[PDB]
């Protein structure tokens, strides 16, 4: 009694992994080695940006198994191998319960330049969409409210950090946390503000020595609304300590960043110390010249600093935090060390979706 | 009531609308699956790889023969073992996605029958009809 | 998410022209009719004009005809009312309004502006 | 036109009380009827579209009912964040207009 038809371009799109390209503005003028990368590396961007709101449908997003976060890392690496030259790498090669791994030495040249990085986008071929969560106080995995269609992301700077969050977005109402899994004592917690914390940090006119200072009140109240964030997953009366570290290399133990190409390493023994129950704060980082390379296991070691002043400020906007399970108190301790984790409070929000736009229903037609 | 005419939602703008109201904004998503050294060439991929995305589609509707495209109509029975659901459920009151969801496994035994169904008994019935 | 952000107050001298401006966040502006809603000071709502934001197409109360033009831009979502020949009794507060809009027809305004004080 | 009525002009009521506000139209306009809360100062919210269906976002204890040229609006209790003033409109042919207004105290 009834006849099927076929449907061309219908609203039906389908979960894929496909590549994309970052499509950032490039200056084309200036060596500071993120623009000449950019010109090689993809289009300048388009002025007035696509921002199509939808109508009421939920999607699954689900921020610790993302694709982007793999595309993320592969340009990084590939921006970073190519634009810092080292003075020397040893890397283990490990040939084949006896392995027996010779330490593989690389020398080449090595100058000083600057390294300001630059906001980038994200944005897919013809036939894709990118698909953005809108609630504003986003879980990270489950079901959206209302999301909307992008043509591409807002801009991200690819800042490398450890132990803390740099010139990233702040939330939308309040201080977020987000986890894999609650009680699971192995995986990191990200933490998201809601306002910045200005923190300047600079080599003053020895040439390996850095003061680092911080507001203390405005961290004080960031700190006071972060616990108040996080008391309502562990029954709102225990007590919640900060610690400083335990343990590990150089860039794990310590806040390792960069600033001005120079690979700062801070210590932040004084910055998680009190324990919560129910005028500037300063930092002495000191520059080394051996770093543990994040890109693959290895060592590098560079050439000494270029003498002068070097100043930097930053916006401390989250934290990499884990917890320390015991037998109660609660005591959290700050992690990091894997980019795609620090990646990850950049593009918790993201999903990558492929039209097919074919489709048959049943209706009373005839030829 | 009054009315000042028609709207535009914009690409992918009734994916949470009806099964009716998303039947005349065909037009909008049709034209986005074209739209248009090292680092150099995958751009060029990309273009070419959805120019073949976009041309596969075109001849899997040319050949089940239409091309009068957006909608066309065939003789092919839907089988009530398939959507048993009532035509006003699945027309006023369901999304598309969902029906795509429902139809995600049985989709290419239709595909399969629409090609070979509909192209030796609808053609060469044409030739034998104007034998005169 | 959905909310419609107007400009300042404004007092201007009689026998002038005025403009208003109405700009739409959170919600695609293309789709959805546009509603002018005046209020007196002490009085109730009156209704003005209503305007499709992709066609252009503009519609205004016979009371206002003539007299009241009701223009659009694409580019930046904004609307823009004129209200020309100003006397004593157009001083108030004015409102632009999200119409609803099911079925290609008024239904209902669901998201208004913070509202202008005109004078 | 078409002039739109309502009754009483000023209510006075306590907290916990079940009152109704009738809208009447001097003309036929079926079903096509818009209820609206202002407060003083604020903008206007919709509580009632299409006469009988509840907007999400405002609490169950509203009701609407009616057609033709008579409409009751209906609250079973009230509550101290309910007390504001009260409009239904038509958008049946031009011109629209909206109610005189009720102050509920």
């Known amino acids: 009694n009834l006849w099927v038809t076929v449907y061309y371009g219908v609203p039906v799109w389908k979960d894929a992994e496909t590549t994309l390209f970052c499509a950032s503005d490039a200056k084309a003028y200036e060596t500071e080695k993120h623009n000449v990368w950019a010109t090689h590396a993809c289009v300048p961007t388009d002025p007035n940006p696509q921002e199509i709101h939808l109508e009421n449908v939920t999607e699954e997003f689900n921020m610790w198994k993302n694709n982007m976060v793999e595309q993320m890392h592969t340009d990084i690496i590939s921006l970073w191998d190519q634009s810092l030259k080292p003075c020397v790498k040893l890397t283990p090669l490990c040939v084949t319960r006896l392995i027996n791994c010779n330490t593989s030495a690389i020398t080449q040249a090595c100058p000083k330049v600057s390294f300001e990085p630059i906001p980038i986008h994200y944005c897919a071929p013809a036939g894709f969409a990118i698909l953005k969560c809108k609630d504003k106080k986003f879980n990270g995995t489950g079901p959206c409210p209302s999301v909307s269609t992008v043509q591409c992301t807002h801009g991200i700077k690819p800042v490398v950090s450890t132990q803390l969050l740099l010139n990233g977005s702040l939330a939308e109402e309040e201080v977020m946390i987000r986890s894999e899994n609650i009680t699971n004592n192995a995986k990191n917690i990200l933490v998201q503000f809601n306002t910045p914390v200005q923190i300047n940090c600079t080599r003053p006119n020895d040439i390996r020595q850095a003061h680092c200072n911080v507001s203390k009140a405005t961290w004080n109240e960031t700190l006071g609304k972060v616990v108040k964030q996080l008391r309502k997953h562990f029954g709102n009366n225990t007590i919640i300590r900060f610690a400083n570290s335990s343990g590990g290399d150089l860039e794990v133990t310590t806040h390792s960043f960069n600033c001005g190409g120079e690979f700062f390493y801070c210590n932040t023994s004084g910055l998680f110390n009190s324990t919560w129950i129910s005028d500037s704060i300063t930092l002495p980082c000191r520059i080394k010249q051996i770093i543990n390379m994040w890109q693959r296991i290895g060592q590098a070691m560079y050439a000494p600093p270029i003498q002068g002043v070097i100043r930097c400020v930053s916006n401390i906007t989250g934290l990499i935090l884990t917890r320390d399970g015991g037998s109660t108190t609660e005591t959290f301790r700050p992690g990091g060390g894997d980019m795609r984790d620090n990646w990850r409070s950049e593009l918790y929000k993201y999903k990558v979706v492929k039209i097919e736009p074919l489709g048959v229903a049943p209706t009373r037609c005839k030829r | 009531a009054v009315g000042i005419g028609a709207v535009f939602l914009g690409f992918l703008g009734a994916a949470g609308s009806t099964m009716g109201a998303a039947s005349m904004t065909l037009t909008v998503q049709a034209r986005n699956l074209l739209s248009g050294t090292v680092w150099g060439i995958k751009q060029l991929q990309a273009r070419v790889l959805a120019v073949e995305r976009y041309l596969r589609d075109q001849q899997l509707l040319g050949i089940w023969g239409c091309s009068g495209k957006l909608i066309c109509c065939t003789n092919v029975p839907w089988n009530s073992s398939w959507s048993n659901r009532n035509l006003s459920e699945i027309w006023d009151n369901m999304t598309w996605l969902q029906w795509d969801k429902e139809i995600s496994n049985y989709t290419q035994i239709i595909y399969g029958l629409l090609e070979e169904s509909q192209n030796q008994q609808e053609k060469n019935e044409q030739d034998l009809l104007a034998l005169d | 998410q959905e909310v419609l952000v107007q400009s300042g107050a404004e007092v201007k001298k009689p026998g002038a022209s005025v403009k208003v401006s109405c700009r739409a966040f959170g919600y695609t502006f293309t789709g959805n009719a546009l509603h002018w809603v005046r209020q007196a000071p002490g009085q109730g709502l009156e209704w003005l004009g209503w305007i499709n934001p992709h066609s252009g197409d503009t519609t205004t109360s016979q009371k206002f005809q003539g007299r009241v033009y009701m223009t659009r831009d694409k580019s930046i979502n904004t609307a823009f009312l004129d209200v020309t020949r100003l006397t004593s009794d157009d001083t108030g507060i004015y409102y632009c309004?999200?119409?609803?809009?099911?079925?290609?027809?008024?239904?209902?305004?669901?998201?208004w502006g913070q509202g202008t004080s005109v004078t | 036109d078409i002039q739109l009525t309502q009754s009483p002009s000023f209510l006075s009521a306590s907290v916990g009380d079940k009152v109704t506000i009738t809208c009447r139209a001097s003309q036929g306009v079926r079903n096509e009827l818009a209820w609206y809360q202002q407060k003083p100062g604020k903008a206007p919210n919709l509580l009632i579209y299409?006469?009988?269906t509840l907007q999400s976002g405002v609490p169950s204890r509203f009701s609407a009912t009616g057609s033709g040229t008579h409409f009751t609006l209906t609250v079973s209790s009230l509550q101290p964040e309910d007390f504001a003033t009260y409009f239904c409109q038509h958008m049946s042919s031009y011109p629209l207009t909206f109610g005189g207004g009720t102050k509920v105290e």
């Open positions: 299409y006469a009988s």
């Open positions: 309004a999200r119409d609803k809009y099911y079925g290609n027809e008024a239904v209902g305004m669901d998201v």
